[PDB]
Amino acid sequence: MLSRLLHGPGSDKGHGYFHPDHGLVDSAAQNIRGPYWHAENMQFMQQETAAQSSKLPVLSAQDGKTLQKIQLTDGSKVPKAATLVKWNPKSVHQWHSDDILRVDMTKHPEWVRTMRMFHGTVWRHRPEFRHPWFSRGSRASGIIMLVFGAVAYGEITFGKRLGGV
Amino acid sequence: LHADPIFNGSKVVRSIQMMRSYHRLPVGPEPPHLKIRGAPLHPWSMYT
Amino acid sequence: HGSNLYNRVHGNLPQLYVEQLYNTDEILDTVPHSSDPVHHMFPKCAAASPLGFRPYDNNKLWDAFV
Amino acid sequence: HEGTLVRISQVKKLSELQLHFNDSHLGESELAAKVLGKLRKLEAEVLARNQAFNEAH
Amino acid sequence: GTNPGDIALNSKRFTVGKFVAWACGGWGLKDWIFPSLFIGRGDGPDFDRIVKHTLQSSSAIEKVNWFDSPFACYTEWFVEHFPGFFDSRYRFEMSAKTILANKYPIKDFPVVDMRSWRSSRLFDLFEVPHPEHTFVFGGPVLLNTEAKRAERLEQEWHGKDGTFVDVHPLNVATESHTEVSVIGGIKVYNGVWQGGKDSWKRDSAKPELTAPFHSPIWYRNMFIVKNADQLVEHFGENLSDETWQEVRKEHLAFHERFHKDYSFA
Amino acid sequence: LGHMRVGALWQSNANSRGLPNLLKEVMAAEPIYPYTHPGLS
Amino acid sequence: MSTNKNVFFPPALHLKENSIFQYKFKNLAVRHDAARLGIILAGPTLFYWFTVYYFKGMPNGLPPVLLNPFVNRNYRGQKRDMPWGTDCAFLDTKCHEEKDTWAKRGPFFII
Amino acid sequence: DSVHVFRPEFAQGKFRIDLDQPAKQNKLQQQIYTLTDDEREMYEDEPYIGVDHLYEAHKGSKENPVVVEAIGVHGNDVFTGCLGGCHKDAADAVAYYTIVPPNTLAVCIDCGIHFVARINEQLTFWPDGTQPWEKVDFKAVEGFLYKHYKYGSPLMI
Amino acid sequence: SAWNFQELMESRIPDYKGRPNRSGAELEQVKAALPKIEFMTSYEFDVLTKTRSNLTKEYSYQRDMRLKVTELMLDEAPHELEGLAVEGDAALKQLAELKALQTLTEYAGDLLEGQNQIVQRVNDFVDSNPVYLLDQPLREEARWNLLPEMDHKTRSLVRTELRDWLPAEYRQTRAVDLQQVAAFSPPVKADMFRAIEARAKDAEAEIRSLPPAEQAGLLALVKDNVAKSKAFIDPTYDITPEAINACNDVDALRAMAHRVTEYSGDARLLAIYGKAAQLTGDTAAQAILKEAKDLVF
Ligand SMILES: [Zn+2]
C-alpha cells in the first residue's frame, strides 16, 4: 500500500494512524495518560512518601500536602504486601491517581541535566554562549580560517610560498 | 487630566499616514474620466 | 531604538536578563520582551520616510560615499 | 506595597485608578544606575540559586 | 509626498550634492542649461489651485470643525488634491452629528483607514518597511472556523453511516446550564458561560457617564473592511442597497461642479 | 542605554495602531452635550 | 496539574514476567526481527566458516587478470604526476619508499 | 513477577506546554481541510434543515456576530480572514485576509458580515519544572498578573 | 515504524447514532418518571429571556464599576468647574463650562475602560490555564476536551468551578434586568414606582431649598426624569383595567393588545381580548379565552 508506506490511513480512509503492535505508538498519550496499549498485561500496585524531598531546590516549589500524597517504592522488586489495581483503558484519570505506588525518578541523570539547564546555570539566549570557552575557540577558529584563506590566495597567485622569507 | 493610554482611548486617531495596501485602486462613487483638450489636468488622473 | 532594560529588569522573569551584564548585544543576543520596540527592516528608511526625507543626502560627504 | 490589582470598590479618588511609576521622573544617568544595581542584585541571587542547586543535585 | 528640508542650501548653483548627483545619478548639465525642460514646474504646493478650490467652496468652509482636528496640518494637501473637500467634510461631520443626536441607545460610527482594505496576499497588510519579525504569534484566523463543518461530506469521506446526521436526541436537563435566573418566581435555566466570546457586546462600546439610566447613550466605533477590488458594497443592516444607490446618485450629482472643469487627458 | 521607556502601557506602533475615536475627530473643540443633553448647562 | 508530576514520580507497573525483556518478546514483530537475525546467523555465517574449514589446505587457482601489456608500458606517453608529487599510487606503500614521496613535508602551521 | 517503570519524557518548555494542555495547543496547530471540486458540487445541493433560516438571525448579524479569538499581545491588531464567497458577489478564488483592531465590532462590506476578532494572551507558568502539581489560588497569580500588566513579560521564543 | 510523523492529538470525527430506541416498557417507565410538564410556546420563552434593560448584557461588576466611576467623577466636578475664566457673555461661559465637563467625563471614561480591560484580561487568563485551576476528576476532562466537546454535566461543572476560582468582583454573571423583574412580578413594579415617587418628592424638596431660576429648571428636569423612569420600568403602565373598560375602539383595543403582548403577555390580554370579543360577537374567541384563563393564565 502506497498510503500505508507513506504513513497514511491505508486502504480504509476512515482509519487511524497508530499501530502499536509494530512499534508505531502515540508518544503524546503515553506522556499524558500512560501507555494504555499495555493495559491488559500490566497492573498498578496499591498499598515512604515523597515528603522527604520537600526541601530540595526544585521540589520545594510544591506544597507539602502534594508531596505527602505521593507514595514511593524502590522500583526493583515487587512489594509483597502491595495489592494490584487493574489498569482500565479509556480512563484518563487512573494514571494520575495518588493511591498507586510510584518511583522517585529525580536522581536520573537526564532529570538532573534538565533541571541544571534550568536551575543550575545562568540563562543564555544562545546555547553556544552557554559554554564560554568553546565559543572563544570557535571564533578563534573563524579568524584562523580567514587568515589561512588570505595567505593561501596570496601565495598561490604570486608563486612564492612564504617559507623562504 | 490624563489617563493611562489604552488602545481604544479617546485620543486615538485614524491611521491615514502609514501606507499598508499600497497598490490598491480606490472604488466607490467616482467622477467620469472626461478628457477635454487644453483644460487643467484633474488631481486624480495619471497625468500631471 | 532605545533599550528596554528598565522594563525587562522590572518585568516578570528578571532572571533571564542577568546575562545582559556580560558581553552581550541586546538586539541580537537577548530574550525578546513583550514590551520591546518594533524593529524595522531598514531603520534608515523607516525613520526617514515618515519625515518625508530620503535616507541619504548627497550634500553630506559621508552619505554620498556610503 | 506593589503586589496587587486595584479594586474599584475601595477607590476613593480617580487618581487611584492610574498606575504609578516611581522612576518616571529620573534622569538618564540615574535610571541607568538604578537598572544596573537591580541587575547586579539579580545576578547575586541567581548565583546563589545556582550554587544551592548544584550542591543538592 | 516630499519634504524639501532646507530650501536655502539646495538653491545654490554649484553644490556638492549637485556634483555628486552628476557623477552618480540624478543631475546633469541638462538641468544647468535647460532647467525649463528638466526641472520645469517642479513638485510642490500649487497656490493658485488652493485658492481656486477655496473660493469655489460654499459656506460649508465656515461650519466645519476641520481646523481644530488633529489632521488640520494637512489642510493644504487636501484642499489642493481633493476637489470639493470642504463640502464633503461638512456632510461627513453633519452625518456624525445626526447619528449622535439619534434616538437609539447605541451610536455606531463607521471608521475607515489604511487597515480597512483586505488582500489575498499577506505582505500587503503590513506597514512599509516591514517589521523585522512578523507573525510571531501565529498567522491569521479564518472566520470560517466558526461555521458548521460539512458534516455529511466528512462522514462520507470516512465511510461512516451518517444516516441520522440531522436526527439528534433532545436534551432537557438542569445539569447542562450554568446561567440560572429567577424571574417572578420562575427559575429559568438558559445558557452556559463560554468566556471571552460572551462579553463582546460590552467590550465594544463606551458609555456616556452623564447619560441617565433610563436614557442610556453608548458610543461604538464600527470598523469597516473592504476588498477594493469588488465594485459592490453590502453593508448589511447598517445601510440598505436602495439607500446606498440613492446616496451614490446624490453624491455624484452634488460633487460635479468641483469636477467638470478638469480633464484627465 | 538612551531613553528607556518606563512601564508597558499601550503605545501606537507598527503592530498596533488602536481604535480611532471618530467622535473626537469630528467634534474637535466643540461640545457634545448640546447634542446629547440639549438645553442644559 | 502539570504532567511533570508523572515525570518526577512516574507510576510503577506490575508484570507477570520475570523481566520486561520476556514480556516484550511476545510481540510478533519483535519475534520476526529476531527470526531474521537468527536466519542470518544460522545459515550464512555457520556455512561460511564451514567452507573455510572445508577448503583450508587447498589452493586459490583462479587465473590472474591481465592489466597492461609489455608494449604499452609507457601508457601511450600520458602524464602521471600525482597530486603528492611523485608517480606512485596512493596505497602503493612499497613503491613510495623507492621514490621517497614524503621528504617534501610542509610546516605544522602557515609558517 | 517484576516491576516496570516507563521512562518519562523529561523535556520542558514548549514540549511541556504542549503536553500540559493538549486540547488548546492542538486547536492552535490542527490543520483543517476545505472541500474539493466534487465535494463543492455535493455540498451546494444539500438541503437546509428546517425553516429556521427563514426566520432566525443568521450567524454574522449586527446582534449575532462572528466572534473569533487569536493569541498575541494585548492591543495588537488581529489577523483574520475569509475563505472567500460569503456572498454571491464576493470573490471566492482564494482566501482573503484582514487586519482589524481587537475587541471591536468590524463589518465586512464585501459579504456583509459583522465580526469580533479579539485577542487572548497566552500567559503561562514559567516551564522549568516548578509548575504547580495541585490546585493553585489567586494570590501568586495575582502578583504575576499585576507585574505582567504593569511591565510585561518575556516571550517564549 | 522507524518513522513517526504523529501530531499532538488526532482530529475527532463525531459518531452520530441517533435518537434512543426505547421500547414500550421503557417508554412507560420513562413517562411514569416525568414530572407534571407544561410545554411552553417559543413566544413565552422569548418574553421570559428577552433583553429589555441590560442592553449591552454587561455583568454585575461592570455595572458596579460604571456607577462607582460616576460617583467619583461627580465628587470632582465642582473642583474642575471652579474658577473658569473666559472672555465673552453668559452663553460663551456656559459653553466653556460644558467643554470642561466633557473633558472631565472623557477623562473618567478612560479609567473605567482600563479597569474593564484589566478584569477581562484576568478572566482571559482563567480560560487560558484551566487545568491549573481545577481539581480531579474535572482536570483531565478539561485537559483532553474543549468546551464544545465536553459532556453537558462535565461542561457545566468545569465552567462553574472556573468561575468560582475568581474573587467575587471578577466573576462574570449577567446583571439583573429591572424591567424584566418588574414585568414578571406585579409587587416589584409597585415597589419600583414607589421608589421613583419617593425620590421625586425628596428632589422637589431639595430644589425648593434653592434660588428661583434653578428651582424652575430643576423642577422641569425632575418631572421629565420621573416620566421617563416610569416609561423605562413599565412602558404599559397606563393600560389599566379601568382604561380597558373605558375603551370602545377596535383599533385602540388592538393596539393595547399588541403593546401588552410585546411587554409581558399577562391576563390583561384576557381582559382586552374579552372586551374585543364582546364588541364584535366572537363566540369562538370567547370559548378560547375561557380555555386560556383555565390553562394559560
Ligand atoms: Zn467574506
Side-chain angles (χ1 to χ4, degrees):
Chain A
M1 250 295 173
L2 264 179
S3 300
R4 194 66 61 89
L5 178 69
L6 296 177
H7 293 265
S11 181
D12 184 3
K13 304 302 179 183
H15 201 201
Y17 169 67
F18 293 101
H19 301 262
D21 287 356
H22 71 70
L24 190 62
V25 305
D26 193 3
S27 305
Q30 169 168 205
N31 301 327
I32 303 172
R33 47 167 292 187
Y36 63 88
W37 45 92
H38 296 102
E40 63 154 5
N41 297 128
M42 294 185 187
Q43 288 180 333
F44 298 112
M45 301 182 298
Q46 190 176 220
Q47 206 72 286
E48 185 191 8
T49 61
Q52 56 184 344
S53 299
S54 171
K55 309 303 296 299
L56 295 178
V58 187
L59 297 87
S60 62
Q62 306 300 324
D63 301 336
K65 305 182 183 303
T66 302
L67 295 182
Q68 289 169 3
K69 291 170 185 175
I70 300 175
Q71 304 167 202
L72 303 184
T73 312
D74 218 3
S76 54
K77 55 177 177 296
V78 183
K80 193 180 65 55
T83 60
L84 305 174
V85 169
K86 178 180 175 57
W87 188 348
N88 187 96
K90 291 96 71 175
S91 177
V92 301
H93 311 273
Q94 213 168 6
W95 195 251
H96 306 274
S97 294
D98 290 322
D99 294 66
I100 60 178
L101 299 177
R102 313 178 103 91
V103 177
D104 172 68
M105 288 275 289
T106 61
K107 297 181 178 178
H108 204 269
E110 182 60 14
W111 189 96
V112 179
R113 189 171 298 104
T114 313
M115 299 308 162
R116 175 179 166 88
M117 189 276 192
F118 275 104
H119 287 86
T121 53
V122 180
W123 183 263
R124 313 297 250 105
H125 194 236
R126 288 169 64 171
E128 68 253 22
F129 280 154
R130 294 187 99 92
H131 287 284
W133 289 98
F134 173 82
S135 306
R136 198 176 202 79
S138 64
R139 59 175 65 98
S141 299
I143 300 300
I144 263 61
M145 288 185 297
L146 272 165
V147 172
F148 170 97
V151 170
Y153 274 139
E155 290 181 4
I156 296 177
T157 60
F158 294 168
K160 45 187 173 186
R161 42 178 292 267
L162 194 115
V165 292
Chain B
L1 295 195
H2 283 250
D4 299 2
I6 47 177
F7 71 92
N8 51 6
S10 56
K11 301 185 181 305
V12 184
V13 293
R14 285 167 40 244
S15 283
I16 67 176
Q17 183 190 154
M18 308 296 291
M19 197 79 72
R20 283 189 181 263
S21 297
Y22 173 52
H23 294 281
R24 64 181 180 267
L25 183 60
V27 286
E30 41 197 336
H33 280 202
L34 303 180
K35 293 179 178 55
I36 311 99
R37 182 174 298 182
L41 279 166
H42 197 81
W44 298 347
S45 59
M46 53 183 288
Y47 292 113
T48 177
Chain C
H1 306 290
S3 54
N4 201 72
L5 199 58
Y6 179 86
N7 280 330
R8 290 183 166 191
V9 172
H10 286 259
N12 219 311
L13 279 170
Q15 280 70 13
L16 305 189
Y17 304 101
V18 174
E19 68 165 345
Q20 202 121 6
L21 293 161
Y22 307 156
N23 198 24
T24 310
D25 189 59
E26 176 159 354
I27 293 181
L28 300 177
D29 312 342
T30 50
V31 182
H33 206 260
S34 60
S35 61
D36 261 2
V38 178
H39 298 284
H40 295 267
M41 261 305 299
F42 297 103
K44 203 161 177 58
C45 298
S49 41
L51 301 171
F53 307 112
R54 253 78 91 193
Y56 294 103
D57 194 16
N58 294 335
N59 291 320
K60 296 185 183 64
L61 298 184
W62 176 244
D63 283 18
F65 167 77
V66 169
Chain D
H1 187 7
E2 169 189 322
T4 53
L5 307 170
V6 180
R7 305 297 195 275
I8 212 170
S9 53
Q10 304 177 9
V11 173
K12 294 181 174 58
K13 51 187 179 66
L14 287 175
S15 56
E16 294 186 9
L17 295 175
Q18 299 166 270
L19 296 164
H20 182 231
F21 298 98
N22 298 269
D23 308 330
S24 57
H25 73 273
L26 296 185
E28 289 184 325
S29 178
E30 296 181 356
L31 197 60
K34 188 177 183 300
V35 172
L36 296 179
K38 277 201 66 51
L39 268 182
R40 282 192 296 272
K41 290 183 293 185
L42 292 167
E43 180 187 16
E45 296 181 7
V46 167
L47 291 184
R49 163 171 67 74
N50 298 11
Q51 174 56 221
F53 174 90
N54 283 313
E55 177 266 332
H57 288 293
Chain E
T2 309
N3 186 9
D6 189 356
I7 303 281
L9 57 88
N10 287 325
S11 60
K12 293 185 176 183
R13 202 183 213 96
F14 301 138
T15 319
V16 177
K18 297 188 182 187
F19 280 96
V20 168
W22 189 15
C24 298
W27 193 268
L29 300 170
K30 67 188 199 317
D31 313 75
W32 268 310
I33 308 176
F34 306 110
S36 298
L37 301 185
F38 297 90
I39 306 178
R41 168 61 178 82
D43 168 56
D46 201 63
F47 183 91
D48 313 71
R49 179 150 294 185
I50 294 170
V51 173
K52 175 188 174 183
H53 288 347
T54 300
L55 294 178
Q56 278 188 333
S57 177
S58 170
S59 299
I61 184 170
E62 292 182 340
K63 297 188 281 291
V64 175
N65 300 287
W66 168 261
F67 301 99
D68 313 326
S69 59
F71 299 149
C73 47
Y74 307 137
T75 300
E76 295 172 16
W77 174 265
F78 286 105
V79 164
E80 182 183 356
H81 292 295
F82 179 174
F85 170 63
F86 286 127
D87 308 70
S88 187
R89 182 70 183 188
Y90 179 59
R91 281 185 170 182
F92 174 88
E93 296 184 354
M94 290 303 302
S95 307
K97 292 172 192 172
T98 179
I99 288 178
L100 171 67
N102 253 340
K103 82 179 199 294
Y104 302 138
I106 297 179
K107 280 63 181 300
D108 300 69
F109 297 102
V111 179
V112 176
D113 66 66
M114 286 293 181
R115 289 172 295 181
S116 294
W117 311 107
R118 296 156 56 83
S119 187
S120 60
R121 60 211 84 81
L122 277 165
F123 63 79
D124 256 331
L125 305 175
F126 294 105
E127 293 183 349
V128 294
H130 299 331
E132 178 68 1
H133 309 288
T134 50
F135 299 121
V136 175
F137 298 89
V141 191
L142 300 182
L143 292 174
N144 302 258
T145 60
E146 294 296 329
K148 184 182 294 183
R149 310 187 307 270
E151 306 297 342
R152 275 197 239 252
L153 300 169
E154 185 177 340
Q155 297 289 126
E156 181 178 294
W157 171 275
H158 290 248
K160 291 190 172 186
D161 191 63
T163 300
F164 307 109
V165 65
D166 299 328
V167 183
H168 292 282
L170 304 177
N171 174 84
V172 178
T174 74
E175 289 77 15
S176 66
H177 300 287
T178 67
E179 299 287 331
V180 187
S181 309
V182 175
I183 309 176
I186 303 174
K187 189 192 297 172
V188 185
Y189 295 79
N190 180 27
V192 177
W193 173 61
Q194 299 189 229
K197 60 203 305 304
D198 294 355
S199 58
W200 74 269
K201 183 70 174 302
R202 173 63 229 268
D203 286 67
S204 306
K206 307 186 74 172
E208 173 56 38
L209 301 185
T210 47
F213 75 101
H214 57 258
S215 296
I217 297 176
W218 299 81
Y219 307 108
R220 182 193 278 162
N221 302 283
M222 284 194 67
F223 215 71
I224 289 177
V225 295
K226 192 189 170 171
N227 201 332
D229 311 352
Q230 182 159 320
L231 305 165
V232 179
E233 303 85 10
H234 297 300
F235 299 87
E237 303 88 64
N238 309 288
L239 175 59
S240 69
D241 198 70
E242 319 88 31
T243 309
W244 178 225
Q245 299 303 319
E246 156 179 340
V247 168
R248 284 178 139 267
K249 292 167 185 168
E250 198 285 331
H251 180 271
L252 291 164
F254 183 83
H255 300 262
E256 184 223 2
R257 50 192 300 276
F258 311 109
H259 291 289
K260 67 175 59 163
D261 271 9
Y262 293 142
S263 74
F264 291 67
Chain F
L1 300 181
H3 296 266
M4 306 180 300
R5 59 176 301 184
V6 179
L9 305 181
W10 182 82
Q11 286 188 187
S12 170
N13 50 281
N15 300 343
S16 77
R17 295 292 181 181
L19 177 59
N21 194 245
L22 177 145
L23 189 63
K24 185 163 189 57
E25 171 175 336
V26 167
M27 298 295 294
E30 184 181 354
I32 302 175
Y33 296 142
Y35 296 99
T36 61
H37 308 268
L40 304 187
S41 63
Chain G
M1 310 205 297
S2 59
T3 58
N4 270 325
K5 167 182 168 64
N6 307 295
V7 175
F8 283 47
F9 310 98
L13 298 156
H14 174 84
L15 291 173
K16 291 293 183 183
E17 292 76 3
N18 304 336
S19 64
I20 183 65
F21 178 90
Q22 303 184 17
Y23 170 81
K24 264 183 170 59
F25 265 85
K26 300 186 175 182
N27 187 332
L28 287 309
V30 184
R31 294 183 90 90
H32 278 303
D33 293 357
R36 300 177 185 107
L37 180 60
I39 284 170
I40 287 302
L41 281 176
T45 69
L46 291 177
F47 197 86
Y48 178 94
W49 299 109
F50 164 79
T51 64
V52 174
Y53 170 78
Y54 196 88
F55 307 99
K56 182 179 178 58
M58 298 179 183
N60 180 92
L62 288 182
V65 301
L66 310 171
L67 297 177
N68 192 245
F70 184 87
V71 302
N72 196 259
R73 52 189 163 79
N74 298 267
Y75 297 98
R76 285 169 271 267
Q78 184 182 7
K79 162 175 162 292
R80 281 289 185 87
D81 181 82
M82 295 293 95
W84 48 88
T86 65
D87 190 358
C88 284
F90 183 73
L91 289 184
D92 287 4
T93 59
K94 62 175 184 175
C95 295
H96 282 297
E97 301 174 5
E98 283 80 61
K99 299 178 73 63
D100 43 73
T101 319
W102 309 116
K104 297 167 60 179
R105 289 294 179 184
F108 198 88
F109 202 62
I110 301 171
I111 190 173
Chain H
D1 296 62
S2 62
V3 172
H4 185 55
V5 179
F6 284 105
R7 182 186 177 277
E9 177 56 28
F10 293 105
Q12 298 291 336
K14 247 168 167 45
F15 209 28
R16 192 57 47 173
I17 282 176
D18 281 55
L19 301 180
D20 278 332
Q21 299 166 10
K24 186 181 68 176
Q25 303 294 314
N26 180 46
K27 178 67 179 299
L28 288 175
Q29 71 180 11
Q30 169 147 114
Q31 289 291 344
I32 40 179
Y33 311 82
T34 190
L35 310 182
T36 70
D37 191 354
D38 47 352
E39 285 182 336
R40 289 186 242 114
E41 298 271 355
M42 290 186 290
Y43 183 90
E44 273 294 318
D45 58 4
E46 289 181 1
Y48 295 97
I49 303 169
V51 301
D52 297 64
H53 65 275
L54 300 173
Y55 296 85
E56 291 181 351
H58 45 283
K59 184 74 192 305
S61 296
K62 193 165 185 174
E63 290 75 6
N64 181 31
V66 184
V67 185
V68 290
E69 310 197 37
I71 68 176
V73 190
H74 197 243
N76 282 22
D77 291 358
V78 190
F79 279 98
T80 179
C82 293
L83 282 179
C86 329
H87 196 271
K88 291 302 203 316
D89 301 3
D92 49 54
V94 285
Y96 290 85
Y97 302 100
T98 303
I99 181 77
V100 64
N103 291 270
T104 179
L105 186 69
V107 51
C108 189
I109 59 161
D110 291 327
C111 27
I113 285 183
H114 303 220
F115 55 98
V116 188
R118 59 181 300 277
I119 281 182
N120 305 272
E121 296 182 329
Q122 296 296 324
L123 247 192
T124 176
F125 294 85
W126 173 234
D128 57 352
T130 57
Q131 292 119 316
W133 298 352
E134 219 68 344
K135 189 170 185 175
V136 77
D137 290 9
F138 186 76
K139 247 67 74 172
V141 173
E142 177 180 14
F144 289 144
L145 295 182
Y146 171 85
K147 261 156 60 179
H148 169 65
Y149 305 152
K150 195 173 181 175
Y151 295 113
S153 45
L155 305 184
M156 173 78 72
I157 284 181
Chain I
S1 184
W3 318 78
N4 183 236
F5 290 87
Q6 67 175 305
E7 298 171 345
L8 181 53
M9 182 192 302
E10 284 182 323
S11 52
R12 294 149 66 160
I13 315 300
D15 294 308
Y16 284 108
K17 278 68 181 300
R19 285 165 179 168
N21 306 331
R22 273 161 186 161
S23 57
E26 299 175 356
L27 236 68
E28 294 179 346
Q29 191 175 14
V30 169
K31 287 182 291 185
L34 301 185
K36 42 181 169 182
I37 297 172
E38 310 177 1
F39 295 92
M40 290 173 57
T41 313
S42 273
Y43 158 81
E44 303 189 43
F45 188 60
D46 169 66
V47 295
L48 265 185
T49 65
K50 199 201 306 182
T51 289
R52 303 165 172 272
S53 171
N54 206 23
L55 171 70
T56 49
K57 300 176 289 184
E58 57 181 352
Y59 307 131
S60 302
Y61 71 84
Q62 290 171 348
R63 184 188 57 187
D64 300 349
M65 282 168 49
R66 179 166 42 79
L67 299 190
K68 181 71 173 188
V69 171
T70 49
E71 297 171 33
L72 301 178
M73 177 269 291
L74 293 177
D75 289 359
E76 303 182 11
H79 171 51
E80 307 295 341
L81 299 189
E82 178 184 3
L84 294 181
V86 66
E87 166 269 352
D89 53 1
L92 207 154
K93 178 67 173 299
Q94 173 178 337
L95 290 178
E97 281 190 344
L98 278 177
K99 193 72 174 61
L101 174 63
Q102 175 181 332
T103 300
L104 171 60
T105 56
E106 288 185 348
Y107 164 78
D110 288 5
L111 301 171
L112 173 65
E113 184 58 28
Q115 299 306 311
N116 275 340
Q117 290 183 8
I118 291 172
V119 178
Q120 178 56 47
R121 284 218 264 175
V122 175
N123 288 91
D124 283 8
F125 167 90
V126 169
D127 283 326
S128 180
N129 297 334
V131 308
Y132 298 103
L133 326 169
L134 295 164
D135 291 319
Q136 298 291 334
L138 299 193
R139 178 180 302 157
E140 264 64 22
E141 288 294 320
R143 162 177 280 125
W144 280 109
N145 298 280
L146 295 177
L147 190 153
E149 304 173 358
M150 288 175 192
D151 173 48
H152 286 277
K153 186 160 56 182
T154 57
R155 181 187 308 160
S156 303
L157 290 175
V158 168
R159 302 314 297 173
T160 53
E161 183 174 348
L162 283 181
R163 182 197 278 169
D164 290 0
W165 178 83
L166 287 142
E169 62 269 3
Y170 297 155
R171 298 178 185 174
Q172 300 203 344
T173 67
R174 304 294 182 184
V176 181
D177 287 62
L178 315 182
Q179 180 172 157
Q180 187 177 47
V181 304
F184 290 99
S185 51
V188 176
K189 155 150 44 53
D191 297 357
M192 288 186 168
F193 279 31
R194 251 181 284 103
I196 294 170
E197 296 303 344
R199 286 296 182 187
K201 182 185 290 186
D202 200 4
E204 285 180 24
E206 183 188 17
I207 292 164
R208 275 195 285 269
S209 73
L210 292 181
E214 305 177 19
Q215 283 171 349
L218 300 173
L219 285 175
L221 285 178
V222 163
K223 294 292 191 301
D224 295 6
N225 291 340
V226 175
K228 282 203 273 292
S229 306
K230 279 180 174 174
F232 179 89
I233 291 300
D234 174 7
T236 70
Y237 74 97
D238 53 321
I239 302 178
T240 54
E242 312 302 347
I244 300 171
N245 289 254
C247 188
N248 302 97
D249 278 323
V250 184
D251 302 325
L253 289 173
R254 185 187 296 277
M256 291 183 178
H258 286 18
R259 298 215 294 115
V260 175
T261 304
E262 290 269 341
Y263 179 75
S264 58
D266 54 76
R268 291 192 303 194
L269 285 183
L270 292 177
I272 297 167
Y273 283 147
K275 191 166 192 305
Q278 284 191 353
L279 279 178
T280 44
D282 191 322
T283 55
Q286 290 191 350
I288 295 174
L289 284 173
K290 289 183 68 57
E291 297 188 32
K293 67 174 66 181
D294 173 65
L295 298 176
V296 177
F297 304 106

